[PDB]
Amino acid sequence: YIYLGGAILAEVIGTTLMKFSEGFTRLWPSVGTIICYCASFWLLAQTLAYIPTGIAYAIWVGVGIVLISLLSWGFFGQRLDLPAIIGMMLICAGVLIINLLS
Amino acid sequence: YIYLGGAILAEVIGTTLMKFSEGFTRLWPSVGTIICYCASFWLLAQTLAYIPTGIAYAIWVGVGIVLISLLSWGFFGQRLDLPAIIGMMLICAGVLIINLLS
Numbered sequence: 001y002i003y004l005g006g007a008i009l010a011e012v013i014g015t016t017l018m019k020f021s022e023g024f025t026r027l028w029p030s031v032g033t034i035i036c037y038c039a040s041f042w043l044l045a046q047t048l049a050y051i052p053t054g055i056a057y058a059i060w061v062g063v064g065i066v067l068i069s070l071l072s073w074g075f076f077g078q079r080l081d082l083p084a085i086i087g088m089m090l091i092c093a094g095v096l097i098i099n100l101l102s
Numbered sequence: 103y104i105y106l107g108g109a110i111l112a113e114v115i116g117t118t119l120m121k122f123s124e125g126f127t128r129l130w131p132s133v134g135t136i137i138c139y140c141a142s143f144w145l146l147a148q149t150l151a152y153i154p155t156g157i158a159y160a161i162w163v164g165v166g167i168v169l170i171s172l173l174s175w176g177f178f179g180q181r182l183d184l185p186a187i188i189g190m191m192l193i194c195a196g197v198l199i200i201n202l203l204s
């Protein structure tokens with residue numbers, strides 16, 4: 001399977017685990033989070049062995065924001081009609097335009 | 103919060119070290135570059151206490167594009183055509199909308 005899909009998913013899980021849980025996580029040992037950080041770098045290194053960095057970055061930002069928006073609504077219950085989402089979308093549209101002219 | 107600004111600088115130091123290692127020095131450990139990127143993530147983790155992860159991803163890319171553009175050309179805002187001007191305005195305006203939001 002693609003390293004890139006694993007790598008984006010590893011960043012989403014790993015970054016989500018950064019601010020999550022003042023008690024100790026259900027299902028998951030905390031050394032698993034350390035392994036996940038190591039796995040994320042391994043997946044990234046495989047990804048940027050084979051995929052050009054700037055081309056990859058455009059895919060990566062677009063997939064990552066959507067994936068964590070879906071996760072934010074799904075697992076954390078977050079609203080889709082918050083004005084911050086609109087602000088984020090303006091940035092997402094703007095970064096896409098710069099990416100096409102560079 | 104100015105932590106994401108620090109995370110951007112930690113990204114600039116680490117990215118330059120990676121590019122320096124690939125193109126120029128033969129004698130730089132991978133672990134040091136990884137620690138510089140981990141510093142960007144620690145500064146991000148402090149940010150993720152205050153700014154939601156999806157919002158934080160979009161701001162990191164857009165704030166990145168302006169600083170990286172300025173450093174990589176050595177000046178800001180030369181050779182802008184009409185959609186590029188709109189692209190820069192959208193990035194600034196979206197971040198400003200998030201900045202005004204609590």
Ligand SMILES: Fc1ccc([P+](c2ccc(F)cc2)(c2ccc(F)cc2)c2ccc(F)cc2)cc1
Pocket residue numbers: 044047053056057060061113117139140142159160162163166
């Ligand atoms: F929202 C974002 C913000 C940053 C990145 P980042 C990054 C961050 C932390 C890290 F540990 C290693 C790499 C990147 C760029 C293209 C990819 F395929 C995968 C990752 C990156 C590195 C150098 C650079 F100049 C710009 C971005 C990705 C999405």
